[PDB]
Design a protein around this ligand. Structure first.
Ligand SMILES: COC1=C(OC)C(=O)C(C/C=C(\C)CC/C=C(\C)CC/C=C(\C)CC/C=C(/C)CC/C=C(\C)CC/C=C(\C)CC/C=C(\C)CC/C=C(/C)CCC=C(C)C)=C(C)C1=O
Ligand SMILES: CCCCCCCCCCCCCCCCCC(=O)OC[C@H](COP(=O)([O-])OCC[N+](C)(C)C)OC(=O)CCCCCCCCCCCCCCCCC
Ligand SMILES: CCCCCCCCCCCCCCCCCC(=O)OC[C@H](COP(=O)([O-])OCC[N+](C)(C)C)OC(=O)CCCCCCCCCCCCCCCCC
Ligand SMILES: CCCCCCCCCCCCCCCCCC(=O)OC[C@H](COP(=O)(O)OCCN)OC(=O)CCCCCCCCCCCCCCCCC
Ligand SMILES: CCCCCCCCCCCCCCCCCC(=O)OC[C@H](COP(=O)(O)OCCN)OC(=O)CCCCCCCCCCCCCCCCC
Ligand code: SF4
Lengths: 68, 115, 156, 171, 105, 80, 51, 318, 98
């Protein structure tokens, strides 16, 4: 019947959901728990560079709070 | 660096597939297999003879319309202007001119094809 | 176990691919083409067996000679066979094609397509039933299933 | 990454030389598309995004139409490629080697005046508004709709009258 | 312009983006805004021939700001001398010039 | 000539809708009451630093603090 | 003032039109069969096409 | 790690296309009252791999009359662009955040035409030339209206970046404000992918095969792979632009799943249409577009320039 | 910047050389005209971006607009030329010598 279309469509769906989930998780993991910052504009790039220079480890995601 | 990396990986993947395709299968090459194809009977002429185009006018009109799309594309940034009256008036003028040109070419049987 | 074992399994995979996906070229010369169409029809459904028609001989595997092979036609059939890429197989369906058929003693008809091309499977009939042609296709799949090309190379 | 823009410019020169040697129009259009891509990359490296993407788009369309016309009208039985004629092939290789020699000669004669293979890439981008917001070329090109309105007026009339002109010419 | 129709009518179809100091979108000043303004104001009033001699200082400064040749040569000389010293083993760069510095926010 | 328009609506609907929406686009900006607010919002969007002005003592209107009652107010946008 | 080089020149036509050799318009020839999906199997419909 | 991300974005997409072939064949079968593939593995799940193997193991061919350079280049370019276009897509976080993502997509897709064109010329065969020139006509049709459609929706999006579309449709679908634009976009994508009804560049009936008449084995496989990657890509683009999924910053996987559902449904709709409808005559395709879509598209472009101004709803830049 | 501008100048010069030195095909000459246009566009855009003179970036797009218009006129002339002399070879374009 029509139920036999669903198998290949299931393989489809898994292979099409894998990309987004994978990229999101990789971004979080490689940017330390926060989704990748976006530099649409030179101001945001400047802020990210300031964060990198302030981290002391040369990584923009490492954050410093009032304790600093 | 990342866009370069991804596009280079794509290029390498495609090239690797091409190389596999061209160097894996067993090859038996002879003239009949390598000659062009035309539905069973040998060609009667070359494929490089002139091939008249019946839509040349709309080809050039496509060039012009592509450039007018070019003029239109800055609109998303333009709309942030403080001179909205002028922006809107100029965009309306441009689109109206496009429409009138299309209307003229339509009424002069331009979008039709030569026979 | 042995390089022979791995080569045998590789050959098995090779033939599994080739037999599971074989694309007949859209060739049809007379009545027997109608029974080929019916074989394509829903009731038997060639596609179910992985068989799908393709027009360009450049993208085909099996040439199903369906119908009489007239002298005038013979050169065209020979060239399309030659232009098919290897590996390629020829299936002859109908008396018209296996031999001269009803028109065997005529001045125009080539008495059998096997004279113009090397045939693999001969399907008899007039017209062979769509079921008969399906059985012939399965026979060709069996023929491919026993190939031993890689094994013959390794032993070579 | 210091020689990036110089390499792109050199590849652009190579593409333009190939175009100049006027091979068959099909291969000329191929080389022209490659040159357009190189120019887009150069503009993007200099930081303009809209302009480079823009040439790429416009000229994909333009060279499509050029393909159509050349295959409808500018075709021979035996189209000539770059390697078809030893004259063209030899002058292509000669162009490459002579341009390299000229680059070296200028480098040695004056190391700063024009070409500076020493410090190549140091003097690409000069100033940047680090804390600015709008800096992208899109805003500048959108100036047409607000300040440089005369510019868009003339361009639009150019296209509008172009339609009539081509209609009558092809009549 | 050969016909001063724009000046007569008091309109500026194309006179308002002639140079770098002109108004730019969203008040993003260009490179050498100050130098070009100085040159333009110096040359205003006095004719072209007088300007070519009198406003020479301003024009030269603007050329320097715009094309930057003397700065390029200055840097080339510095780096060539540093390379010579390094080959002779006379000089070593400081940590910050070598990439190891204490970053400033 | 209502028959002409009505036959057009019957046989060549696309052109009729195109011309109608073109007319509506030209008309509505004049009719609409909210047209004024577009330019005001664009001006409101503060994209450059508000350079302070030296207090010479002759500047009553300009404020001395962002939270002072003087100067532009954006409540008209806050409840546009 | 004639010259050996130009002796083969002729006066231009009174109207600008020049009696030019007729261009023999050649139309492509296409087999369109027999082995074609739309040729019913055994038709060599040699077509003469422009565009 | 970026390489792991590249793998996780390419391998699943290639598998998705591979199985799209099977899904097309089975859906067409069950809609034509037949079962389609169902022998090669349980429910025919191994048929795509069987066919890929057969194609890559069949002899590759270099006809004597071909321009071998472009003959080998164009397929590679087709697959390269097909894979590349997946890069900027936000699902929801993009692999590569380009500010002018939509312009990137437009330019790359427009370059895809040159694969067909150069392949058709290099084949040096009459049917191949026919296919190349029909591709010329198809592009001349679709591009002019595609660009204006995207501009019209962008006037409400606010920017050319795709990632902005998610926030724009955080409350509703773009379809409701602009279904008229959406249907023309859908037909235009149909035309662009060379899919039926506008399957003219490879009209198996008229021409035995268009550009890919002299191409066999792995090169032909590359062309087919690029085709069925582009189908999924365009359906994904529709799902992102219109038919906006749901974004909850805490739950990205919800966006991922909603996107997969909508893209799968639209890709199936493509095959539905293929089975349902006949084919156009490329002159009729061109007339359709230029004389119906283009006028209305231009009028809607002016309408959507007006709407932000007179509704006081100009979107935020950035 | 300076080396890139020099290279672009050489590219334009080579395109102009190709334009001034014909080679049988008129469409090829039109393509060389295009190559010159593209080199000029790139030079203008680079200059504007490097100067940060945003008020000048409309000018390059107008360059493209008018270059496209000229190319369209050229292609129409090619249409007429082929419809007359059967091909696009410039040798046949010599009726006005007398
Ligand atoms: C004589 C006339 C008759 C007998 C009447 C018979 C019927 C006809 C003449 C009409 C029949 C033919 C047609 C309508 C066109 C045929 C096409 C169809 C039925 C539907 C579409 C199916 C087709 C074309 C078969 C295509 C299947 C394929 C597998 C094509 C190639 C696809 C690929 C190579 C993709 C595979 C890629 C992969 C597996 C990559 C995976 C990668 C990784 C895992 C890293
Ligand atoms: C995701 C699915 C898609 C996957 C696509 C990739 C497919 C990868 C296939 C791996 C199997 C590799 C073996 C392929 C052999 C194909 C060509 C062939 O059969 O010739 C055998 C050849 C033929 O050997 P031979 O020379 O002894 O055969 C006789 C030769 N003539 C005809 C001249 C008399 O043997 C090989 O060299 C194969 C060894 C390759 C390792
Ligand atoms: C783009 C390049 C434009 C600028 C000129 C390029 C100059 C370097 C070419 C090197 C010489 C190659 C040649 O002679 O051409 C012969 C070939 C034509 O060869 P052919 O068609 O005669 O086939 C050769 C047949 N055998 C193998 C038997 C001899 O044309 C080309 O090489 C041009 C290919 C495009 C190169 C650019 C690749 C860019 C990627 C695609 C976009
Ligand atoms: C067989 C032949 C195969 C040939 C394959 C050819 C592949 C071509 C693929 C199509 C590419 C066409 C589109 C042009 C590339 C896109 C350029 C672009 O728009 O963005 C470049 C990007 C800057 O973008 P953005 O990030 O938004 O702005 C800066 C703030 N982030 O950042 C960059 O500057 C990156 C610049 C490089 C862009 C990639 C070019 C790769 C070319 C490889 C050859
Ligand atoms: C300086 C050398 C210039 C290049 C000379 C190329 C050979 C030549 O004949 O130049 C003219 C050429 C037209 O020659 P052609 O129509 O092919 O007829 C055969 C003539 N022996 O016309 C051409 O082929 C165009 C030449 C353009 C050269 C541009 C690049 C020069 C690089 C040095
Ligand atoms: S074999 Fe019999 S049924 Fe088949 S084509 Fe010949 S006469 Fe007809």
């Amino acid at each position: 019947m029509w139920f036999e279309i669903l198998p290949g469509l299931a393989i489809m769906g898994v292979c099409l959901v894998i990309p987004g989930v994978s990229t999101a998780y990789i971004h979080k993991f490689t940017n330390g728990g926060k989704e990748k910052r976006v530099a649409r504009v030179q101001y945001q790039w400047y802020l990210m560079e300031r964060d990198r220079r302030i981290s002391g480890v040369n990584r923009y995601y490492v954050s410093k709070g009032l304790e600093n | 660096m990342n866009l370069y990396t991804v596009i280079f990986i794509n290029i390498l993947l495609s090239l690797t597939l091409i190389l596999v395709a061209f160097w894996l299968p067993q090859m038996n090459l002879y003239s009949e297999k390598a000659n062009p194809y035309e539905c069973g009977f040998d060609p009667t002429s070359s494929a490089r003879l002139p091939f008249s185009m019946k839509f040349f006018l709309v080809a050039i009109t496509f060039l012009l319309f592509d450039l007018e799309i070019a003029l239109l594309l800055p609109l998303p940034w333009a709309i942030q202007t403080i001179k909205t009256s002028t922006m809107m008036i100029m965009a309306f003028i441009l689109v109206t001119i496009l429409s009138l040109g299309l209307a003229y070419e339509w009424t002069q049987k331009g979008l039709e094809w030569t026979e | 176990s042995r390089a022979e074992y791995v080569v045998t399994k590789l050959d098995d995979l090779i033939n599994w691919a080739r037999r599971s996906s074989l694309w007949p070229m859209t060739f049809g010369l007379a009545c027997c083409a109608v029974e080929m169409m019916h074989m394509a029809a829903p009731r038997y459904d060639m596609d179910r067996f992985g068989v799908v028609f393709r027009a360009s001989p450049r993208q085909a595997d099996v040439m199903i000679v369906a119908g009489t092979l007239t002298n005038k036609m013979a050169p065209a059939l020979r060239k399309v066979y030659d232009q098919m890429p290897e590996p390629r197989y020829v299936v002859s369906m109908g008396s018209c094609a296996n031999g001269g058929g009803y028109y065997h003693y005529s001045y125009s008809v080539v008495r059998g397509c096997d004279r113009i091309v090397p045939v693999d499977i001969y399907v008899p009939g007039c017209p062979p039933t769509a079921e008969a042609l399906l059985y012939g296709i399965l026979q060709l799949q069996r023929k491919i299933k026993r190939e031993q090309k890689l094994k013959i190379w390794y032993r070579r | 990454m210091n020689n990036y823009i110089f390499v792109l410019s050199s590849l652009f020169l190579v593409g333009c030389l190939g175009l100049a040697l006027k091979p068959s129009p099909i291969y000329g259009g191929l080389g022209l598309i490659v040159s357009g891509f190189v120019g887009c990359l150069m503009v993007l490296g200099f930081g303009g995004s809209f302009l480079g993407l823009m040439v790429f788009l416009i000229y994909l369309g333009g060279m499509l139409v050029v393909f159509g016309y050349t295959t409808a009208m500018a075709t021979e039985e035996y189209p000539e490629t770059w390697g078809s004629n030893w004259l063209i092939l030899g002058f292509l290789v000669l162009g490459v080697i002579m341009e390299v020699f000229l680059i070296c000669v200028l480098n040695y004669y004056d190391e700063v005046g024009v070409i500076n293979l020493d410090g190549l890439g140091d003097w690409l981008m000069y100033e940047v508004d680090d804390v600015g917001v709008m800096l992208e070329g899109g805003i500048g090109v959108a100036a047409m709709y607000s300040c440089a309105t005369w510019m868009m007026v003339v361009a639009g009339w150019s296209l509008f009258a172009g339609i009539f002109i081509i209609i009558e010419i092809t009549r | 312009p050969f016909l001063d129709i724009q000046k007569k009518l008091g309109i500026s179809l194309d006179r308002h983006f002639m140079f770098l100091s002109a108004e730019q979108p969203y008040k993003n000043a260009a490179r050498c805004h100050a130098f070009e303004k100085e040159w333009i104001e110096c040359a205003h009033g006095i004719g072209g021939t007088r300007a070519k001699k009198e406003c020479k200082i301003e024009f030269d400064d603007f050329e320097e700001c715009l094309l930057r040749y003397k700065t390029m040569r200055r840097m080339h000389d510095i780096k060539k001398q540093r390379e010579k010293l390094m080959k002779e083993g006379k000089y070593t760069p400081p940590p910050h010039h070598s990439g190891r510095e204490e970053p400033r926010p | 000539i209502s028959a002409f328009l009505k036959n057009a609506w019957a046989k060549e609907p696309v052109l009729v809708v195109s011309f109608s929406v073109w007319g509506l686009a030209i008309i509505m900006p004049m009719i609409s009451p909210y047209t004024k607010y577009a330019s005001m919002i664009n001006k409101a969007t503060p994209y450059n630093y508000p350079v302070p002005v030296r207090d010479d003592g002759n500047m009553p209107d300009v404020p001395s603090h962002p939270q002072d009652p003087l100067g532009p107010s954006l409540d008209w946008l806050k409840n546009l | 003032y004639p010259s050996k080089e130009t002796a083969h020149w002729k006066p231009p036509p009174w109207n600008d039109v020049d009696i030019l050799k007729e261009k023999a318009v050649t139309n492509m020839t296409l087999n369109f069969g027999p082995q074609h999906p739309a040729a019913h199997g055994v038709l060599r419909l040699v077509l003469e096409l422009s565009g | 790690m970026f390489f792991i991300n590249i793998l996780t974005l390419l391998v699943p997409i290639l598998i998705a296309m591979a199985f799209l072939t099977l899904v097309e064949r089975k859906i067409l079968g069950y809609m034509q009252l037949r079962k389609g593939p169902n022998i090669v593995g349980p429910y025919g799940i191994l048929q795509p791999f069987a066919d890929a193997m057969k194609l890559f193991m069949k002899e590759p061919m270099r006809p004597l009359t071909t321009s071998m350079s472009l003959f080998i280049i164009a397929p590679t370019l087709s697959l390269t662009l097909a894979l590349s276009l997946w890069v900027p897509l936000p699902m929801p976080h993009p692999l590569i955040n380009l500010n002018l993502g939509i312009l990137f997509i437009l330019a790359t897709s427009s370059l895809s035409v040159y694969s067909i064109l150069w392949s058709g010329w290099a084949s040096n065969s009459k049917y191949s030339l026919f296919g190349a020139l029909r591709a010329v006509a198809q592009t001349i049709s679709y591009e002019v209206t595609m660009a204006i459609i995207l501009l019209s929706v962008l006037l409400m999006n606010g920017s050319y970046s795709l990632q902005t579309l998610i926030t724009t449709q955080e409350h509703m679908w773009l379809l409701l404000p602009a279904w008229p634009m959406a249907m023309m976009w859908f037909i235009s994508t149909l035309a662009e992918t060379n899919r039926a009804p506008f399957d003219l560049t490879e009209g198996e009936s008229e021409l035995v095969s268009g550009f890919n008449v002299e191409y066999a084995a792995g090169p032909f496989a590359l062309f087919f792979m690029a085709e069925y990657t582009n189908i999924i890509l365009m359906n994904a683009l529709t799902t992102i632009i219109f038919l906006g999924p749901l974004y909850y910053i805490n739950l990205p996987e919800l966006y991922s799943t909603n996107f997969m559902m909508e893209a799968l449904l639209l890709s199936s709709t493509f095959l539905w249409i293929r089975a349902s409808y006949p084919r156009f005559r490329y002159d009729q395709l061109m007339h359709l577009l230029w004389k119906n879509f283009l006028p209305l598209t231009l009028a809607l472009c002016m309408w959507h320039i007006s709407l932000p101004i007179f509704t006081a709803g100009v979107p935020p830049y950035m | 910047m300076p080396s890139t501008f020099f290279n672009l100048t050489m590219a334009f010069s080579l395109s102009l050389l190709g334009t001034l030195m014909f080679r049988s095909h008129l469409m090829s000459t039109l393509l060389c005209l295009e190559g010159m246009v593209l080199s000029l566009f790139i030079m203008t855009s680079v200059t504007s971006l490097n100067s940060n003179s945003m008020s000048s970036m409309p000018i390059p797009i107008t360059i493209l607009v008018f270059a496209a218009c000229e190319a369209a006129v050229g292609l129409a002339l090619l249409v007429k030329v082929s419809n007359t002399y059967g091909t696009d070879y410039v040798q046949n374009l010599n009726l006005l010598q007398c």
